[PDB]
Structure formats: C-alpha cells, structure tokens
C-alpha cells in the first residue's frame, strides 16, 4: 500500500521505466521532530549524527555510540533523558567520576530552565559526597525519579532496588566492563533475569541501552550485549590520520633534533630505550624546556599539560602508563622518533620463542625446499625449522625490501608502534582531523629505508625529507588545533549508509578505519565506524535486492507499445526484508552511498536502491575498481549518480535471458518431456562448436615419434633417415603480453593451473574482495597511471611504459600492490594484510596475475628462433622452433614455448609411431578464446555459459578436454534444426554488441527491445 513519492512505479513490485502521504516515513518521525525542536531550546541545532541516535532510541534500539569527538554525545544523552522523562518514561545515566555526575545534574536543570518544569519529582542524583539528609532523601524517593544520574560505582553496589529504566545511558563503557557483574546488573535493570535452572536467561527488553565505544580490553563478557541487544561494542581508536611524516638519516642531538625543536613546542620525543632516553635529557636541557617520564617519576606530565614544560622525552612503553595512554589533542602538536621503532631477533636467538613467530622467519627466504614446511601440519614442528635456520642465513641474503639482513641478524621495522606513536599527533573531531607531524630520525641507513618501505604497506605512510615548509607547518598545527578547540561549532562529519554487495567487502571496508561497532537489524548486519569523510555504516545487500518477476506482463515485461520492467523481492529468508531493513538505515542516515561492483549489475543495484529508498536521503554512487582504503577514499571524493546507461544495458541483457531463455528452454521440455533442460542461445552456439571439434577428432591417426629429438612428423614409418637442413636463425626481441583480462585470465587459469572457469571466477572474486587485485570482470587491458607506478616500484630499470589499450573506462585485472605471491603470504602470516578465507589456490592464482602484469610492464625480451627444414621419404617439411629465450619478462611470464634444439644430421632414426586424432577436442581454455575471437559472450558471462553446459549434462570432460554427450547433442541438433535462426552465430554476435552499444549510450534500449519482443513472439 504505497502512494506518493504496494507496487511503486516511476514496494510489492517495483514497476519501473528509467529516465498523499510520504514514502520514507517512520512512526517515531513525529516523535522525533518534537525532540529536535526541544533540543533546539536546550542546546541548539541537533547534529546529523545526534538526530540519527534519537531515532535509534525513539525506536528502543540498543547500540554502541561510536563517533568523532566534539559531537554532542553527552549532551544528547542528558537531553534525550530529560525528553523521555517529560514523557514519563524514566532514564538512567551512568558516569565514571563524581564530578561528571554533578556536572550532569546541573546540565539538566539548565535545560529545564527553558520552558521545562524542573520539579523535584523529576531528577535525582547520587555520589560519594552528599551528607546524612540528602543521601536519605535520595534512597527513600529513588523510583519516583524520572531521571537518575549516578557514578558507575553505585551500580555494582546497588543494582537491585533501582527500579528499571526505559533508557539507560553509559558515558564511559570501560567504567563498566571492568567488573563482569556490572553487565548482568545492567541487563537486569532492563528486564533480563538470569535463570540458574536453564543456566541461560530469557527476558523481554524493558528498555534500551546506549554506550560509548571501549578503549581498554574487550572481554568475552561484552559478548553478552550481542546475544541480548544485538550489538558489539568495538574500539574508539579509529585508525585515520593527517600527519606530516618526515624522514631524516641523521639523529644528531645537535644540528637536527634541536633544529626541529624550532617547530614551536609541545613535541613528544620517543627514544629506543629508557637508557637512551635519559641520555638525551642532559644532551638537551639548556635549549628548550624539557621533561622526562617513567616508572621512576612523572610530574613532568602535569608540567607539560600545564605549560611549564614545552616537550617530552620517553618511551613507547612508558608514555602509555600515563592517563589515557597520554592523550592531549590540544597540547601535543608533533612527535619526533629518535631511532626507528624496531623489533629484533638474533641468529643465536632462534631456539626458544613462539612457534607462530618461527613461521614468519620461515618465509623471508624459500630459495631451497623450505616451502616444504610452508604447507604444514603447521607443527611439522618449528624445531626442524629453527635448526634449518641456524645452518643457513649468514651467507644467504634475502630479497625482501621491508627488513634488513646485514650478516646474521634480522631487523624488523615496527610500524604498529609508529602509527600509534604519531597518532597522538592527529585526532578526529567534529571539525575534521587535526594536522599532525612525525619526525623519524635514524642513523642506520639500511634500516631507515626498510621502515620507509614497510610504511608503504600501511598506505598513507609516505615520508618527506625536511623539504618541509616549517613556517607553514607550525601554523597549520597551531591553526588546526585551534579548530578542535572550536569543535563545538562543526558538523562536517555526518552518517552515510555505505552499501556494498557481500559481507566480506563489508568487513574489509569497515575495518579499513578501525574496529567498527556492530548492530544486527531485523534483516541485516551493519558495521559502523567514523572517519574523516563520514560516519560510515557499511552494510551488505547480499547481492541483488530484486530481480525480474515471472508472472506480471510478458515474462516479466508489461508490453503493448510499452516495455516496462517489473521487479520483485527475491527467493529461508526473503530479500524483501533486507529492503525493509535498508530503508530504515537509509531513513536514519538521510544519505546513501552504494559501492557495489563497478559493472552494470553493480549499477543495477544502486539503481534499484536509488528507487526503493526514495524520500529517505540522497543516494550517490561510489565507484572504485579495487577494494582498498586508498581507492575507497578516492571514491569518497568523486561520487556520481547512478549511470542510467549501464542500468539499461543491465536491463535489456536481463530481459533477453528471460525471454529467449525461457521460451527456448520450454521448447526443450515440450519435446521428449524432461524438464531440468536448458537453452541459452550463447550456449547452444558454443555447444555447437564443442561438437564441430569432436567429430573432427576421430581421424588422421598418422604421426611418428623420434626418440632423441623432440620431433613429431606426420609420417607412418618406424625407422628411417631424416635430414635436418638449418636454414634461418634470427634473434628477435619484443614486447610481452598485455595485462590479464577476464578472458585471458580464465584461459591461463585453465592451461597452467587446472582450474575450471567457474572456479577461477570464484577465486578471482574473493581475490578482488580482499583488496589484492583490481576488479575481475573486465574486457579492457588498460593500465591506470597508478598501476604503472606499481610495476615501476617492483621492476625498476626493467620497467617500461605501455598503457595497453586506450578505450572504454575499464581497466585490466592486476595486483593492487607490488607484492609477489610470497610477500603476500608472508604479510598475511605477519598480520600486515588481513584477509578472509584464502587457500593455496588463491595465491596459486594471485601468482599468475602478478606475473602477467609485471611482465606487461617489463622490458622487451630476447628470444632465439631456429628454423629447420626436414626432408624424408620424398616429403620435406619445414618448421621453426624456439631454442632459447632470456630476460626478465620471461623469468616472470613464460609466454613462449622453448622446445628442444636439435643439431643437424642425416642419421638413423627410431620412431615409436602412433594413431593420433586429426585434432584434439577443445579445452575450457581454447573454447574460451573462441568465444572472444568469434564474438560471443562477455566477461560477466564467459564462465557461466561454459559452466551451464556441464551442469545440464550437455558436456563432460575427459583427459581434461571437453566432450559432448548424446543428451546434449540431441539437444543441440534440436534447436539447430528448427530454430537455427534464433541461435545463429551472427544473430548472437550482433545482438551481443547491441548491448555493449546500449551500454555505451549509442543504441536505444526501447528500439532495442522491439526487435527483441518481435523476434520472440515470432514463435511465442
């Protein structure tokens, strides 16, 4: 029952073309607007994110409030508390310090001092102060208070006897997670009574709870909030930053560290060891105001905070010891690292130490047969490795660039610390993200470099070289922080439901900014995290929310001088729920960003979404051809609107498969009644070629095989006398092959690795989804500037240009970072590149992609081609062969066949001879190429077409080659003999283009559908 803007038209069924109440209205919407106005009277204009919370609460939804500082969280809670009390709902606000409780009480009265009541029968607070009389007055009346504020302590002590609350607000969540019972005691207050008997609970949410993100340990106790309130807490670290990173190969206490101290003050220095730290204090004290910390004594911290001190010296270890691990958003302005934060592992150390710490070192090499522990019972045992280690390593020099070997000893750069250390230098506020600066000075050249390189892995980790504008810097910092102070006046950071296809993608992306807080809505999981651009709430559509219906109109299309696609919910869950789920989130954000795949189907999803979530909020489209923090941000800076052109091509293509597919398949059920049969045009065609290869394979059983020479001649004599007459022998050097494209990838994936095309696509997808390669569906070989810069960083000297193809807007399939298969595997073990469900096969694949690509950009290679002319039994054949090829490109991608060479000589031969087929049956690899050469099928379809044939039992494979079956044959011959004109290679090849055409905005879909509708009813 939907009007304005069941059955929405341009949500029972979406009846859409393309190019009196409201649609995105929720119940609590009238309860909200009141609240806003209310807020406008006690604090001001509700911030986007503050409005989103309200909704959550007005719908009684518990969750972990995660957002930038400076945003009015505390005010909200208080305010919202007061609002619910005016509705006689009662609320509980829990704080972690006496004063906060007091500040809180004031903040309410103040509000109330704006058309509010204020009566005693309203607010009641309690903390460690208060005397004989007011303590009594509290307990004896507690329960008639619509608002109860107290420290997080009073809770543990008096959970029982505290009434229940409709809304309970927790300021600091670590003030609770400290003691397990706190949790229990909270749910209790909400109506969740434990059941010793069942040893589990049971209960109905009486109210709703709202808590901050946590800074300290997690604990399996929090897990309780999941099964009970469908929500995980998650960190308030938020790994984003501005920060200017400067690298100096000099750590001179003099002409350097002190010249940097020219950069105003409030710098925090970090020294390798406590011992090394103090060694500076004296070196530097009669220049600049100092400070030193640690176990010994602090005080310098207060002196710093208060302004006495201008800087601080300490360790990555001790600074944490301080309050909040040392967090002064306004004071701290920059940090200098005296010595690259590193980790050490000695040659004579190997012995004792975590096995999962032996694996890492296990890599870094591999030269010999050490891969033989790679695959492992894991515990094939480290012991065997530790020993293997000792023996080899001194002389052997690894190839890595992120660490140093020297000579017996391996130095590990420690970025974790670095990030964390220079992170105090930049914070996320309602006003953006303070500017930072981190000066890392190290004398150990080789090491510094290793850091520098290792940094790259943590993206946004490039370093300058004192080629800094110091004058500006000092300003930006003092300026920037000035902003923060004025944080109370911004709201640049707003919510934005970011919809991606799969959960994998969801996770990968939300993690790009930290440990997001979760929430499980009626029909969907949402990972919400804050960042410089918005307060993302990445959620996964789980594919297409809707698909072509099967009843309405002609096979889904309303016709009669019309053509109007009809869409329906999908599919034991119904996708209608995800939509209903999505419209709610959308509702709360008032702004949606679809980030589905960068293809037509992807565009088709945003499209529907654009439609379905109408009214709710703007629905922009983020386009990126790789799933990586960097790409995503770039996208977040280049949003566009659904590209209608893609949709139309998305539609039409669909409609065909529906029409030409159904009707034909049907004709296959009418004859020799056997449903479960299937016709597809594209597949009938192929299936055809698949036959017109088999019928040709049962012939010309000629051929003879020499014993020494890799010779194969079409003859029929056992022994004989051959003649090798060396003719030509040129030395050619040329360009490698282009970077893979869906087509050729599926091929090499079949020829080299023995993967089926359905498998490879699956792998590719997962590889793509784990930010390791560009998008896998692509027919372009184009190489983005960035992509060249990737190769250059690996090849070096061997790196050539080669843009490869300069059409379309699509790019080839290739590595996202310069990282061989090992490097990846390593980093994964090392924990630098986190990913989901990847087995050998993936890297088996990732490997070829990397090679193919890096080859494409690599230098031309030298190949030696020696021709040969042979004459025997009156017959003389002349063939040419490759006897040798050398160069980088070949070491990476063995494109050419280096057959065996053969000195000239007319001597006595000994052949085995055999009865070989005229030709041999196609292999997924060859058949995939024909599909391209010939013009049939596309990246989104090559694999599917070929699969079908196998699953409809039309084809089977033998010796790794494709072979038809009667079932199939009789099938092929059926469609061919009687409807050959709908299956004509030409019709399919031309039609296959009308689509690309419509997609590029050249052919008209309407005028495209007529020819299709007509053509089809032409049999009905």
Cβ of residue 171: shortest distance to ligand ANP, in angstroms? 9
Count CA atoms within 13 Å of residue 586 on its CB side. 28
In terms of CB distance, is 46 or 964 closer to ligand ANP?
A: 46
3-state helix, strand, coil in the chain (%, to 5): 40, 15, 45
Residue 59 has a CB neighbour count (10 Å cut-off) of: 16
Residues of the binding site = 8, 24, 50, 73-75, 501, 597
Are the C-beta atoms of 230 and 522 separated by less than 8 Å? no
Q: Say how many residues make up the chain.
A: 1020
**Cβ pair 783, 824 in contact under 8 A:** no
Near ligand ANP by CB under 6 A, which window of 41-49, 371-379, 643-651, 659-667? 41-49
Q: Quick one: which segment of 44-52, 287-295, 367-375, 697-705 binds ligand ANP (CB under 6 A)? A: 44-52
Residues tagged in the binding site annotation for ATP: 50, 73-75
Task: Report the residue number, 431 or 617, with the smaller CB distance to ligand ANP.
Answer: 431
Least Cβ distance, residue 85 to ligand ANP (angstroms): 17
Q: Does residue number 46 form part of the binding site for ligand ANP (CB under 6 A)? A: yes
CA 326 to chain centre: 32
Backbone phi and psi for residue 429, each to the nearest 5 degrees, phi listed first: -130, 175
Determine if 678 is a binding residue for ligand ANP (CB under 6 A). no
Token pair in block for residue 289: 């105001």
Check binding of 71 to ligand ANP (CB under 6 A): yes
Asked if 329 interacts with ligand ANP (CB under 6 A), we say: no
Nearest distance, CB of residue 74 and Mg ion, angstroms: 5
**Cβ of residue 39: shortest distance to ligand ANP, in angstroms?**
7
For the chain, the straight-line distance linking the first and the last C-alpha, in angstroms and rounded, comes to 34
Binding mask 486-505 for ligand ANP (x = CB under 6 A): --x-----------------
> Considering CB distances under 5 to 8 angstroms, the limit depending on partner class, which of ligand ANP, Mg ion, none binds residue 75?
ligand ANP
Residue selected from 34, 45, 708, 886 as contacting ligand ANP according to rule CB under 6 A: 45
984 touching ligand ANP, by CB under 6 A: no
Instruction: Report, in Å, the least distance between residue 78 CB and ligand ANP.
Output: 7
CB burial of residue 475 (10 Å; 0-12, 13-18, 19+) = middle
Strand partners for 428: 433
Print burial letters for 823-835: b (CB count within 10 Å at least 16), e (below 16).
Answer: bbbbbbebebbeb
Burial class (CB in 10 A: 0-12, 13-18, 19+), 665: middle
> Which of 74, 156, 180, 762 contacts ligand ANP by CB under 6 A?
74
Q: Binding of ligand ANP at residue 69 (CB under 6 A)? A: yes
Whole-number minimum distance, CB 212 to Mg ion, in Å? 8
Full 3-state SS string of 490-527: CCCCCEEEEEECCHHHHHHHHHCCCCCECCEECCEEEE
Compute the least distance from the CB of residue 36 to ligand ANP, in Å: 10
**CA atoms of 771 and 966, how far apart (whole Å):** 44
- Residue 680 exposure: Cα atoms within 13 Å on the Cβ side: 23
Query: Of residues 8, 14, 35, 47, which one binds ligand ANP by CB under 6 A?
Result: 47
- The DSSP 8-state label assigned to residue 323 in this structure reads G
Q: Point out the catalytic residue in the list 270, 365, 534, 775.
A: 775
- Four-residue CA torsion sign, 966, 967, 968, 972: positive
Q: Which does 47 bind (CB under 5 to 8 A by kind): ligand ANP, Mg ion, none?
A: ligand ANP
Q: 143 vs 485, which CB is nearer to ligand ANP?
A: 485
Question: What is the total count of residues that contact ligand ANP (CB under 6 A)?
Answer: 14
DSSP state of 486: G
**Residue nearest ligand ANP (C-beta atom):** 72
Q: What is the rounded distance in angstroms from the CA atom of residue 396 to the CA atom of residue 189?
A: 65
Report the residue number, 280 or 305, with the smaller CB distance to Mg ion. Answer: 305
Q: Measured from the CB of residue 460, what is the shortest distance to ligand ANP in angstroms?
A: 25
556 binds ligand ANP (CB under 6 A): no
Q: At what angle do helices 840-857 and 742-751 cross, to 10 degrees?
A: 120
Q: How far apart are CA 72 and CA 49, in angstroms?
A: 9
Q: Distance of CA 621 to CAs 142, 595, 598, 635, Å? A: 52, 6, 10, 9
Q: What's the number of CA atoms in the CB half-sphere (13 Å) around residue 494?
A: 17
Tell me how far, at minimum, the Cβ of 177 lies from Mg ion, in Å.
Answer: 16
Looking only at residues 459 through 488 of this chain, which bind ligand ANP when binding is defined by CB under 6 A?
Answer: 488
Residue 106 binds ligand ANP, judged by CB under 6 A = no
Report the half-sphere exposure of 84 (CA within 13 A, side-chain side).
28
Segment interacting with ligand ANP (CB under 6 A) among 42-50, 172-180, 527-535, 626-634? 42-50
For the bound state, the minimum distance from the C-beta of residue 47 to ligand ANP, rounded and expressed in Å, comes to 4
Site for Mg ion in 228-257 (CB under 5 A): none
Q: Pick one of 62, 75, 239, 924: the residue that binds ligand ANP (CB under 6 A).
A: 75
Which residue lies nearer to ligand ANP by CB, 93 or 632? Answer: 93
Q: State both tokens at 642.
A: 């659904």
56-95: contacts with Mg ion (CB under 5 A) = 74
Closer by beta carbon to Mg ion, 74 or else 98 = 74
**Looking at beta carbons only, is 57 or 290 nearer to Mg ion?**
57
Member of 11, 35, 50, 599 binding ligand ANP (CB under 6 A): 50
Can you tell me which of 14, 57, 62, 73 binds ligand ANP, judged by CB under 6 A?
73
Give yes or no: 775 in active site.
yes
**Known binding site for Mg(2+): residues?**
501, 597
Site for ligand ANP in 235-254 (CB under 6 A): none
The reply on whether position 70 binds ligand ANP by CB under 6 A is yes
Candidate residues 10, 44, 118, 163; the one interacting with ligand ANP per rule CB under 6 A:
44
Cβ nearer to ligand ANP, comparing 48 with 566 = 48
Question: Which lies closer to ligand ANP via its Cβ, residue 69 or residue 420?
Answer: 69
With CB under 5 to 8 Å by kind, the binding choice for 43 among Mg ion, ligand ANP, none is ligand ANP
Residue nearest to Mg ion (CB): 74
Nearer to Mg ion, 58 or 100 (CB): 100
Residue 108 interacting entry, from Mg ion, ligand ANP, none, C-beta within 5 to 8 Å by type: none
The tokens describing 863, both together, are 């190949």
CA 972 to chain centre: 43
What's the CA gap between 87 and 238, in Å, rounded?
36
Order of strands, edge to edge, in the sheet holding 244-248? 244-248, 437-441, 334-338, 267-271, 311-314
DSSP state of 838: -
Query: Minimum CB separation from ligand ANP for residue 106, in Å?
Result: 12
**Cβ-contact 751, 923 below 8 angstroms:** yes
* 3-state SS string for 971-1012: HHHHHHHHHHHHHCHHHHHHHHHHHHHHHCCCCCHHHHHHHH
> Binders of Mg ion: how many residues, by CB under 5 A?
1
In DSSP terms, 526 is beta-bridged to 539
Piece in contact with ligand ANP (CB under 6 A), picked from 65-73, 240-248, 371-379, 396-404: 65-73
Closest CB to ligand ANP among residues 75, 508: 75
Detail the residues annotated as belonging to a binding site for Zn(2+).
Answer: 8, 24
CB-based burial, 194-203: b 16+ in 10 Å, e otherwise: eeeeeeeeee
The site partner of 50 among ligand ANP, Mg ion, none (C-beta below 5 to 8 Å per kind) is ligand ANP
The H-or-E segment that residue 750 falls in is: helix 742-751
The residues assigned a catalytic role are 775
Give the residues lining the site for ligand ANP (CB under 6 A): 43-47, 50, 69-75, 488
Residues that bind Mg ion (CB under 5 A): 74
């Amino acid at each position: 029952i939907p009007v304005v803007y069941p059955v929405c038209g341009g949500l029972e069924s979406k009846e859409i073309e393309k190019h009196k109440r409201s649609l995105c209205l929720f119940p609590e919407d009238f309860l909200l607007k009141e609240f806003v106005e209310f807020f406008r009277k006690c604090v001001g204009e509700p911030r986007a994110i503050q409005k989103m919370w309200a909704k959550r609460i007005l719908r009684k939804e518990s969750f972990a409030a995660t957002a930038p500082t400076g945003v009015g969280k505390t005010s909200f809670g208080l305010a919202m508390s007061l609002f619910l009390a005016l509705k006689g709902k009662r609320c509980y606000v829990i704080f972690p310090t006496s004063l906060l409780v007091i500040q809180a009480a004031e903040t309410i009265r103040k509000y109330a001092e704006k058309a509010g009541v204020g009566t005693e029968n309203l607010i009641g607070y309690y903390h460690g102060r208060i005397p004989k009389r007011e303590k009594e007055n509290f307990m004896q009346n507690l329960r008639n208070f619509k608002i109860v504020i107290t420290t997080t302590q009073f809770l543990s002590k008096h959970y029982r006897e505290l009434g229940h609350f409709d809304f309970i607000f927790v300021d600091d969540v670590d003030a609770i997670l400290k003691a397990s019972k706190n949790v229990d005691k909270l749910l209790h207050l909400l109506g969740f009574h434990y059941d010793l008997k069942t040893k589990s609970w049971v209960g109905e949410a009486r109210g709703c709870l709202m808590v901050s993100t946590a800074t300290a340990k997690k604990g399996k106790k929090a897990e309780l909030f999941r099964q009970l309130l469908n929500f995980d807490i998650g960190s308030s670290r938020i790994t984003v930053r501005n920060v200017e990173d400067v690298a100096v190969n000099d750590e001179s206490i003099s002409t350097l560290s002190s010249i940097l101290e020219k950069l105003g003050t409030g710098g925090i220095i970090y020294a390798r060891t406590g011992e090394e730290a103090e060694e500076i204090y004296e070196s530097l004290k009669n220049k600049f105001r100092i400070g030193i910390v640690t176990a010994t004594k602090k005080g310098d911290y207060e002196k710093f905070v208060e302004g006495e001190i201008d800087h601080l010296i300490g360790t990555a270890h001790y600074y944490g010891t301080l309050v909040r691990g040392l967090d002064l958003p306004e004071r701290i302005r920059f940090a200098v690292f005296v010595g690259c934060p590193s980790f050490r592992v000695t040659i004579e150390d190997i012995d004792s130490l975590s096995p999962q710490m032996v694996k890492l070192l296990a890599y870094l090499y591999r030269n010999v047969d050490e891969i033989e522990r790679l695959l492992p019972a894991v515990e094939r045992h480290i012991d065997e490795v530790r020993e293997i280690l000792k023996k080899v390593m001194g002389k052997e020099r690894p190839q890595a660039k992120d660490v140093v070997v020297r000579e017996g000893e391996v130095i590990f750069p420690d970025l974790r610390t670095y990030i964390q250390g220079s992170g105090r230098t930049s914070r996320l506020f309602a006003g953006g993200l303070t500017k930072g600066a981190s000066f890392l000075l190290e004398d150990d050249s080789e090491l510094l470099s290793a850091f520098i390189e290792r940094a790259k892995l943590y993206d946004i980790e490039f370093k300058s070289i004192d080629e800094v504008d110091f004058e500006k810097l000092s300003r930006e910092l003092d300026e920037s922080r000035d902003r923060y102070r004025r944080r109370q006046e911004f709201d640049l950071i707003k919510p934005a439901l970011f919809i991606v296809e799969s959960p994998t993608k969801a996770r990968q992306i939300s993690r790009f900014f930290g440990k997001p807080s979760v929430k499980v809505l009626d029909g969907a999981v949402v990972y919400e995290i804050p960042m410089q651009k918005y307060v993302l709430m990445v959620t996964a559509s789980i594919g297409h929310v809707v698909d072509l219906i099967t009843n309405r109109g002609f096979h889904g299309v309303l016709v009669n001088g019309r053509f109007v696609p009809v869409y329906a919910s999908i599919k034991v869950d119904n996708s209608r729920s995800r939509i209903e789920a999505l419209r709610k989130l959308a509702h709360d954000a008032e702004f949606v960003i679809v980030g589905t795949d960068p293809d037509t189907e992807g565009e088709k999803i945003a499209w529907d979404l654009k439609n379905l979530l109408s009214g709710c909020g703007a629905v922009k489209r983020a386009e990126f051809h790789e799933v990586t923090r960097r790409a995503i941000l770039e996208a977040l800076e280049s949003l566009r609107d659904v590209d209608e052109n893609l949709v139309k091509a998305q539609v039409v293509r669909r409609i065909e498969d529906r029409w030409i597919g159904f009707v034909l398949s049907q004709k296959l059920w009418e004859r020799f009644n056997n449903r479960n049969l299937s016709a597809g045009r594209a597949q009938t065609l192929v299936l055809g070629w698949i036959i017109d290869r088999f019928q040709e394979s049962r012939e010309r059983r000629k051929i003879a095989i020499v014993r020494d020479f890799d010779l194969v001649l079409e003859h029929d004599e056992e022994e004989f006398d051959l003649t090798i007459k060396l003719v030509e022998e040129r030395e050619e050097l040329r360009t490698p092959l282009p970077p893979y494209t869906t087509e050729t990838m599926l091929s090499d994936a079949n020829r080299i690795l023995k993967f089926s095309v359905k498998q490879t696509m699956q792998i590719a997808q997962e590889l793509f989804e784990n930010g390791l390669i560009t998008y896998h569906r692509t027919d372009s070989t184009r190489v983005s500037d960035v992509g060249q810069r990737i190769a250059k960083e690996y090849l070096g000297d061997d790196f050539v240009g080669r843009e490869w193809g300069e059409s379309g807007a699509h790019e080839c399939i290739r590595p996202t970072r310069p990282l061989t298969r090992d490097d990846v595997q390593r980093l994964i073990q090392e924990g630098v590149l986190v990913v989901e469900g990847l087995r050998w096969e993936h890297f088996a694949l990732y490997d070829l992609i990397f090679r193919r690509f890096m080859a494409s950009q690599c230098r031309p290679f030298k190949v030696v081609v020696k021709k040969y002319s042979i004459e025997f039994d009156g017959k003389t054949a002349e063939e040419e062969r490759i006897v040798r090829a050398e160069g980088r490109a070949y070491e990476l991608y063995r494109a050419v066949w280096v057959k065996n060479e053969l000195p000239t000589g007319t001597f006595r031969v000994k052949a085995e001879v055999k009865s070989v087929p005229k030709v041999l049956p196609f292999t997924q690899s060859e058949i995939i190429q024909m599909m391209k050469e010939r013009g049939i099928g596309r990246p989104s379809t090559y694999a599917t077409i070929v699969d079908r044939l196998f699953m409809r039992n039309y084809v089977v494979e033998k010796y790794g080659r494709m072979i038809p079956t009667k079932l199939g044959i009789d099938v092929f011959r059926f469609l061919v003999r009687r409807y050959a004109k709908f299956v004509s290679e030409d019709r399919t090849r031309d039609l296959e283009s009308r689509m690309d055409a419509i997609e590029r905005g050249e052919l008209d879909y309407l005028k495209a559908l007529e020819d299709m509708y007509a053509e089809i009813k032409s049999i009905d």
